[PDB]
């Protein structure tokens, strides 16, 4: 069959919004506190994550229907899904080739180890790399990747949300476009949609596992002091 | 005449404590977010100031009598006198030669202008340079400089302090050693003591003028978000 204009105008919006919030050359990474290989990578990664939270917010604002939600629900979705969106968008810098996010020379190349000198057991980093590898293998078109992020950011099932029915609607519409698109434009994608949805579940686990780790980190002032105001807020529970 | 052992043991302590908290080569300044010439210098200077607050705390802990105060009064003195101590210790990097703090090549050389791209009018930076120049000209022995910082940090007249009588005592003792020292060891210092005390007053003005500027900066989240957790705390009024 074939897509309608409305859906297509959504694709344009997300693909463009993402382009506007993701630099494939990672040139701003030098404005961060330099990396260092008790949690020497923390200052750097705190800046990396904070930088990205700002970017995720830019992408969310341009997600159709999202800005017409109440500050509370927007904030609700942002707070709860942030870390997830960070994990998805990160995929574009990931590399099965060397199992790591490559955003520069030796400096901005993040190995599994680096995230350890940032306050995270190795046993938890494991499921991350598995996710990155799995996600990367789906070889998503940029239209599918940008959709998947919108869908995730619009999960009605987030602690803090109110109008869970309106969010439910927006996400359902985004889910249609993704299915409709994979059909009309993605060959051999008969079982991709299912796979993409599955990815969201994993994000949930990773999300929760991070919560627990970040919770400990934060309760320790000599470490939470390394974080940035924005991160402390988005991941804090002052809600 | 000549100093007693007690006083002298105080000098040893302050001079050593300062040596332990002040790197004349400014090698850690590269762990800060790089400088950038709307307030592009803010991220850097926020890190510089935060770095220093940590150092001032290390110096304070080793100030005799100080750690035997209640957390509250220590914190009280730290919060209120912090910016002042930062201005004094900064003198060692200042340079009448080129009217600026030189802590490295072009990067870590702070001109009056740089503090402007950090959220501060030029009209307020003026009294700072005047202070730095005046202070620098007193050509203080390291023993006098380290004393002056202890005296300042122990000013009983600080909003928030409780046992203002015990702080009054400690500061009085430190004031003696300074006078006694300038007498026995500093030639032509017949009127230096008076000059050093005068410096404290100026610090008060500078202190207040900063409060007002930092207050505005902080109330704006797009700017306060640039600051560090420690700075937000020491200069915040959650007290």
């Amino acid at each position: 069959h074939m897509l309608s204009d409305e859906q297509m105008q959504i694709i344009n919006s997300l693909v463009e919004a993402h382009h506007k919030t993701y630099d494939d050359s990672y040139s701003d990474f030098v404005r961060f506190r330099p990396p260092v290989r008790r949690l020497s990578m923390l200052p750097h990664l705190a800046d990396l994550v904070s930088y990205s939270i700002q970017k995720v917010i830019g992408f969310a604002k341009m997600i159709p229907g999202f800005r017409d939600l109440t500050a509370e629900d927007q904030i609700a979705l942002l707070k709860s899904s942030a870390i997830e969106i960070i994990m998805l968008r990160s995929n574009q810098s990931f590399s099965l080739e060397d199992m790591s996010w490559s955003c520069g020379g030796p400096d901005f190349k993040y190995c599994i180890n680096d995230v350890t000198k940032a306050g995270h057991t190795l046993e938890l980093l494991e499921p991350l790399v598995k996710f990155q590898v799995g996600l990367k293998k789906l070889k998503l078109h940029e239209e599918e990747h940008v959709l998947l992020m919108a869908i995730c950011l619009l999960s009605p099932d987030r602690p803090g949300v109110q109008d869970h029915v309106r969010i439910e609607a927006l996400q359902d519409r985004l889910c249609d476009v993704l299915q409709a698109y994979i059909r009309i434009q993605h060959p051999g994608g008969r079982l991709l949609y299912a796979k993409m949805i599955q990815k969201l579940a994993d994000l949930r686990s990773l999300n929760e596992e991070h919560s627990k780790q970040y919770r400990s980190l934060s309760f320790q002032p000599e470490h939470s002091m390394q974080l940035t105001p924005l991160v402390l807020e988005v991941f804090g529970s002052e809600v | 005449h000549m100093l007693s052992d007690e006083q002298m043991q105080i000098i040893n302590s302050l001079v050593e404590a300062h040596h332990k908290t002040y790197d004349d080569s400014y090698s850690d300044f590269v762990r800060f977010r790089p400088p950038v010439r709307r307030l592009s210098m803010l991220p850097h200077l926020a890190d510089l100031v935060s770095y220093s607050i940590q150092k001032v705390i290390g110096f304070a802990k080793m100030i005799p009598g100080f750690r035997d105060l209640t957390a509250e009064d220590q914190i009280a003195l730290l919060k209120s006198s912090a910016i002042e101590i930062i201005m004094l210790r900064s003198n060692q990097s200042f340079s009448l030669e080129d009217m600026s703090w030189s802590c490295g090549g072009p990067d870590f050389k702070y001109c009056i202008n740089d503090v402007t791209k950090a959220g501060h009018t030029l009209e307020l930076l003026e009294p700072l340079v005047k202070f730095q120049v005046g202070l620098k000209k007193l050509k203080l022995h390291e023993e006098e400089h380290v004393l002056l910082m202890a005296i300042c940090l122990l000013s009983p007249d600080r909003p928030g302090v409780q046992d203002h009588v015990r702080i009054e005592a400690l500061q009085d003792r430190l004031c003696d050693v300074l006078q006694a020292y300038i007498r026995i060891q500093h030639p032509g210092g017949r009127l230096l003591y008076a000059k050093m005390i005068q410096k404290l007053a100026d610090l008060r003005s500078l202190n207040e003028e900063h409060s007002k500027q930092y207050r505005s900066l902080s109330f704006q989240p797009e700017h306060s978000m640039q600051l560090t957790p420690l700075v937000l705390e020491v200069f915040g009024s959650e007290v």
Partner: peptide
């Protein structure tokens, strides 16, 4: 409060 997030969402 979420002062930062509010400002960022315009």
């Amino acid at each position: 409060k979420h002062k930062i997030l509010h400002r960022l969402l315009q």
